[PDB]
Structures are given as structure tokens and as C-alpha cells.
Design a protein around this ligand. Sequence first.
Ligand SMILES: NC(=O)C1=CN2[C@@H]3O[C@H](COP(=O)(O)OP(=O)(O)OC[C@H]4O[C@@H](n5cnc6c(N)ncnc65)[C@H](OP(=O)(O)O)[C@@H]4O)[C@@H](O)[C@H]3O[C@@H]2CC1
Ligand SMILES: CCc1nc(N)nc(N)c1C#CCc1cc(OC)cc(-c2ccc(C(=O)O)cc2)c1
Length: 157
Amino acid sequence: TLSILVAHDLQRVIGFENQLPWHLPNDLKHVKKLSTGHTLVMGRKTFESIGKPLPNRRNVVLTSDTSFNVEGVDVIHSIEDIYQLPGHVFIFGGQTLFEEMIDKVDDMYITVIEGKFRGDTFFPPYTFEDWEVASSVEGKLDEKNTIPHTFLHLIRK
Ligand SMILES: NC(=O)C1=CN2[C@@H]3O[C@H](COP(=O)(O)OP(=O)(O)OC[C@H]4O[C@@H](n5cnc6c(N)ncnc65)[C@H](OP(=O)(O)O)[C@@H]4O)[C@@H](O)[C@H]3O[C@@H]2CC1
Ligand SMILES: CCc1nc(N)nc(N)c1C#CCc1cc(OC)cc(-c2ccc(C(=O)O)cc2)c1
């Protein structure tokens, strides 16, 4: 399976100045649950924003840099390489990769952050006319998760 995995706000912001604009531990756990034991594919800038590979899953970075080498990271150099990756593969970021892959993926796991943040990085527009809602689960608010958020699993019609 090829899936998108993304958290975006009400205006599809996903990033600002190399950071996630919000602090939502529930969503980090969501990502850990979905992608542990599987594969994340991300563009070079997203990887550098993170700074290191995420544990207990395959980390694949897409770059044109033939010198790029990071222990624990597998490098690919073309979009076509993604399709040769075995198992459940999650397109993880950023804006550029999402723009390249949104018309190709089977389904999307979206965390909708119910706020309006300043951003410089955006998920591409999509329409629910093209996507069936397999599930929609509101995240719980608490001490450490203080912005409303909803977990969507959308499947291409
Ligand atoms: N929540 C997120 O996903 C976040 C992502 N990070 C943001 O991405 C922000 C905007 O840059 P963006 O172009 O969207 O970055 P991504 O696609 O990760 O990475 C772009 C890089 O992937 C590579 N490029 C993507 N498509 C291809 C491709 N088709 N072939 C070869 N390389 C790929 C290429 O790397 P390279 O310059 O080292 O060659 C390209 O410049 C950038 O400012 C990063 O900060 C945010 C923090 C939040
Ligand atoms: C974790 C945020 C996130 N949520 C969902 N649902 N989908 C995604 N694709 C991303 C993402 C991403 C890229 C990214 C950028 C970044 O720049 C600072 C940081 C992270 C990040 C931060 C914390 C953790 C963690 O503690 O588990 C993991 C990734 C992750």
C-alpha cells in the first residue's frame, strides 16, 4: 500500500520555518502507531527538519544529492524509486513531495488541526468529491494536547 501521512491545519499549513507550527503529542503517537514497522518516504528538507531517522521503521529520503549519506537512512534519487519499495509505504512530507505524490497514492491519513497557524509550507488542495471518509475520529483534548484535531482516513474513490 502507498499512503499519504500528514498533519495540516484549517488552511492546509504543515510547516513554518523548519518546524511543526503546533505541539500535539497525540499526533506524534498517531504517527508512531501507523508507521512503526513500515516505511517513511520524505524529501530532503523534511528529513533535515527532523534531523535524524525515526526509530523502528525504514527511513527513505528523496534527494538529488549523490553525496547524501546518513546512517539509518536509505536514499532514493527519483520518484519512480518509491514504487519499488516493499510493504506499507507512507509519504511523510514535505510540500514538494506531497505535490508530487497526491495523485498517485491509494489513501491518506490526515490529522486535521482545527486552528489557523502562520505557515510557509502547505499540503496541496484536495476535494472530498475524490475521497471517501473511511473513518473520522476526534482527538482528545487535555493538559498536553490543547488544540482540537481530527484523525481522517481518506480512500480514493
Ligand atoms: N510537516 C512537514 O512535513 C514539514 C516539512 N518541512 C518543510 O518542507 C518545507 C518546504 O520544502 P519542501 O520542498 O516542501 O521540502 P520536502 O519536499 O521535504 O523536500 C524537498 C527536497 O526533496 C528533494 N526532491 C523532492 N522531489 C524530488 C525528486 N523528484 N527527485 C529528486 N529529489 C526530490 C529535493 O532535495 P534536494 O534539493 O537535496 O535534491 C528537494 O529540494 C521546508 O522548509 C521544511 O520545513 C518543514 C517543517 C514541516
Ligand atoms: C509528526 C508530524 C506529522 N504528523 C502527521 N500526522 N503526519 C506527518 N507527516 C507529520 C510530519 C512530519 C515531518 C516532521 C517535521 C519536523 O520538523 C521539526 C518534525 C517532525 C517530528 C517531530 C517529532 C516527532 C516525534 O517526537 O515523534 C517525530 C517527527 C516531523
